[PDB]
Amino acid sequence: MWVYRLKGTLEALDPILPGLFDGGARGLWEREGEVWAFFPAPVDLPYEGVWEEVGDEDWLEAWRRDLKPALAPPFVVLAPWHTWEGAEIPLVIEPGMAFGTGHHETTRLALKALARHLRPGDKVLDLGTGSGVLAIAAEKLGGKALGVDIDPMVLPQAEANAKRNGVRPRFLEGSLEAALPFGPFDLLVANLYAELHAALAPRYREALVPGGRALLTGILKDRAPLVREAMAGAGFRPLEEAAEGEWVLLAYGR
């Protein structure tokens, strides 16, 4: 579809609005000193506005502007342009393509679990760091973190996010093995999925010091047994369960 931009407020343009509608306008929005009128394709109008086709880009900018802070006590996840009067801990994440915006339930379960199981001074491994939000949160709690991901594309955004938050976790491409050289760790947090955790259970144990913690999420309610089963079999002890919707987080001690 096309947009027809016009300078002025709705109040101001009220006089020609009926005309826009007669011209076939199906949508209308006031966007920062401007009024956008949406049509299927351009039509001839006397208002001296400017036509422009709408695309995926515009559809994000619009979404971006409708974004609101997300709570995850004791944290609040904010867009780089968000304001927060509250007391919760600020986590600035550029709404991007890398997972970790703070809008998914799993991310939220992870943040809350981290605050409970992480202590000032702990070494942390954020397996599948994505946006790097969990690693960033670990540094905010007073921990030293390493975020890894098999997807290279996310690391610059993670690094950029860390920067916005004024903390500097270590980020690197790879999985659990790429990380071992930096271990063992006091805590490991991983937002993946039930089946993969199941296969990794054994390595999770080797990644942690005795008494270390493993926070697993990305788990659907109906796939938790796989994890309970794999973890126990891996010598871990159950410590906490949490869910939001169909998603759950399982915390284990080693």
Ligand SMILES: C[S@@+](CC[C@H](N)C(=O)[O-])C[C@H]1O[C@@H](n2cnc3c(N)ncnc32)[C@H](O)[C@@H]1O
């Ligand atoms: C659910 S996203 C993480 C989102 C963010 N860490 C959070 O807590 O919201 C999972 C990330 O893990 C990565 N990933 C998937 N399989 C992986 C694997 N086997 N090893 C390491 N990272 C993996 C992906 O590239 C993806 O960015």
